[PDB]
Amino acid sequence: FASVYAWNRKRISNCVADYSVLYNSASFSTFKCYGVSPTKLNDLCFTNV
């Protein structure tokens, strides 16, 4: 994991993987969405990630 002033960006594309599926488990401390609701992410379609 890089540091805060040289953060690493990975572009995600060409795949249909369940979001909640991954967020289905645990091991997190904060899951805060803005502009969307984390329960409706499997009904949308996006241009890039």
Partner 1 sequence: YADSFVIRGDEVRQIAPGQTGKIADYNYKLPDDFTGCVIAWNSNNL
Partner 2 sequence: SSALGKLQDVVNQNAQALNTLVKQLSSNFGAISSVLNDILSRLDPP
Contacts with partner 1, residue ranges (CB under 8 A) = 24, 26, 29, 37-39
| Binding-residue pattern over the window 1 to 40 for partner 2, x denoting contact by CB under 8 A | ----------------------------------xxxxxx
- With beta carbons less than 8 A apart as the criterion, state whether 31 and 9 touch: no
Q: Which does 26 bind (CB under 5 to 8 A by kind): partner 2, partner 1, none?
A: partner 1
Cβ-Cβ contacts under 8 Å for 44 (sequence gap 6 or more):
36
Cβ-Cβ contacts under 8 Å for 24 (sequence gap 6 or more):
18
Residues forming contacts to partner 2 in the complex (CB under 8 A) are 35-40, 43-44
